[PDB]
Curated annotation (Swiss-Prot), chain C:
Domain of life: Viruses
Coiled-coil segments on the chain, per record: none
Location(s), subcellular: Virion
Protein name in the entry: Tail tubular protein gp12
Subunit structure, interactors included: Interacts with head-to-tail connector protein gp8, the tail component gp11, and the fiber protein gp17.
Role played: Structural component of the short non-contractile tail. The tail complex is involved in viral genome delivery. Forms the end of the tail, including the canonical tube, the nozzle, and the small extensions below the fibers. Once the tail tubular structure is formed, the interface between gp11 and gp12 generates the proper environment to interact with the six gp17 trimers.
Length: 148, 298, 149
């Protein structure tokens, strides 16, 4: 006999629980939304364009990305393509990536499964999880040294 | 005896010069000194693989097959004591993770006071009883949860978020420090009411403590950024929201990171590869002009 | 970036480092003799993180004199004596904090700002009741955003 409710806080979020399970306010699918606390439910912020990078395979098929915030005026990406490294600025430019020791360490068929990067304030470090750290031979201190 | 590791099968680095471009250098891992093979042991990663770099009390550190290998206190690139006569409290430590079962170490995330180290079926806290770090450094397993090996457990506030290996339609878990006990960890399920929503391969976990969300990319439906917006208030969580952002169909989102309130996103079309900026401004104007902040997706 | 006192020791923050001076004498960053390390020597404890954190403030809170940097927060206490070369440093709570305001303490709390893009926020920084030493940061503009520019 003339019931009324007021679902008042649509912060919510999707829930694929059944109908007689849910809380209020949730919803069954929510695309491009943004559920702030005070203001209710907005259209998401609109993705301002910055400079493009290259072709379709300019990065790898499934690359590894790691952002670097050293300072307020020193900000860089680091994309690990299956063959080599590109590095993009946060404004859309591109720096060059030298290889004075030879690369031979980033080349992996699946870079996000297998390479890492851990960045600290003074250094950066990348680890391949597929290369076995080999013992150095042919650099012994004294070659034979008959000890008597 | 040999006194070097091959400098190429070790982790490299990526250091910038003053010219502007990035170099990709090896690291000069210092020569072994003052010992033998049988008394200055090989550093327990020279026959297997390294998985992570992590810092812990002035010491550079690697994970290994099952081992944790922390470097010397003052000098990062040195895994050998200064003299095997007179052990001098700054020597590198080799603490094998002692388990009942098999656990190969894969990540290292600092959480509350501990810098705990995770591996694929169990979770391990690395703290000592006594000084900072001597050869006496403890290692115990707190919570034996399951964690996927292709996403790095990302921390926002008091929590750390991570993925779990279901077969299909995987899950994300909130990782606590409980209130009542001193040092008991816990992992809840913040997809316990939304399964069947995030497809299989969580390869990046974003976040920002400013706008209070965590998001997850996935290589099972790569056009979707799976947002999880939360808001803690008086120690009780008041918003378990989920969504997913599409940037148009047939468009692959291949990264997501966020400096303070700007989410810089590269995203792949079927012809190009972009770069973008999602700004959480309220009434401000994105570009110079634009009379009403036009919601435009590019 | 900062001057801070901690157990008779003058101290500076740095790029990532914490450099405390000698115990009796403030203006001295060198031990008296590198023969026979004598428990009052200056300490150089680099803040060991997973990520990038450049130290920017130092605020004494409950028992700890914890040190904040822009994306994480670090407690500087030792296990053992006052302060030897063995001094611990761990990160409690990884909250975001603006770099142009000094976190001010009133009672049991310490108040500070956070970098939203526009219309920023202020956060109350706890020590929780239940655990021994768990820190927390709530939001005391959670019901009034869009008010402090």
């Amino acid at each position: 006999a003339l019931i009324s409710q007021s679902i008042k806080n649509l912060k919510g979020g999707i829930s694929q629980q059944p109908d007689i399970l849910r809380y209020p306010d949730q919803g069954s699918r929510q695309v491009n939304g943004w559920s702030s606390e005070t203001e209710g439910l907005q259209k998401r912020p609109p993705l301002v364009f910055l400079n493009t990078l290259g072709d379709n395979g300019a990065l790898g098929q499934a690359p590894y990305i790691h952002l670097i915030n050293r300072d307020e005026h020193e900000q860089y990406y680091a994309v690990f393509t299956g063959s080599g490294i590109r590095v993009f600025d946060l404004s859309g430019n591109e720096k060059q990536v030298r290889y004075p020791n030879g690369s031979n360490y980033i080349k992996t068929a699946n870079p996000r499964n297998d390479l890492r990067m851990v960045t600290v304030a003074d250094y950066t470090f990348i680890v391949n999880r597929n290369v076995v750290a080999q013992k150095n031979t042919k650099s012994v201190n004294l070659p034979n040294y008959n000890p008597n | 005896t040999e006194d070097q590791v091959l400098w190429e099968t070790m982790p490299h680095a990526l250091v910038r010069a003053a010219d502007g471009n990035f170099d990709f250098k090896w690291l000069e891992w210092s020569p072994k000194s003052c010992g033998d093979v049988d008394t200055n042991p090989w550093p327990s990663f020279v026959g297997s693989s390294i998985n992570d770099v992590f810092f812990f009390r002035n010491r550079l550190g690697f994970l290994s097959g099952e081992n944790i290998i922390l470097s010397r206190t003052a000098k990062y690139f040195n895994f050998y004591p200064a003299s095997i006569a007179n052990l001098s409290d700054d020597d590198p430590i080799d603490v094998a993770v002692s388990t009942n079962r098999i656990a190969i170490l894969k990540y290292a995330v600092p959480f509350s006071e501990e810098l705990l180290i995770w591996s694929d079926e169990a979770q391990f806290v690395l703290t000592a009883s006594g000084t900072l770090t001597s050869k006496s450094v403890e290692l115990n397993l707190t919570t034996q949860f399951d964690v996927q090996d292709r996403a790095r457990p990302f921390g926002i506030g008091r929590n750390v978020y991570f993925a779990s290996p279901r077969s299909s339609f995987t899950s994300i878990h909130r990782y606590y420090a409980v209130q009542d006990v001193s040092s008991v960890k816990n992992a809840e399920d913040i997809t316990s009411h939304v399964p069947n929503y995030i497809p299989n391969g969580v390869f990046s976990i974003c976040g920002s403590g400013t706008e209070n969300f965590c998001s997850v990319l996935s290589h099972g439906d790569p056009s979707k950024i799976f947002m999880y917006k939360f808001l803690y208030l008086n120690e009780e969580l008041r918003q378990q929201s989920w969504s997913h952002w599409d940037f148009g169909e047939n468009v692959q989102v291949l990264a997501c990171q966020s400096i303070s309130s700007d989410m810089y996103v590269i995203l792949r079309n079927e012809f190009n590869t972009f770069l973008a900026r999602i700004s959480f401004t309220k009434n401000a104007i994105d570009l110079q002009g634009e009379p009403y902040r036009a919601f435009m997706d590019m």
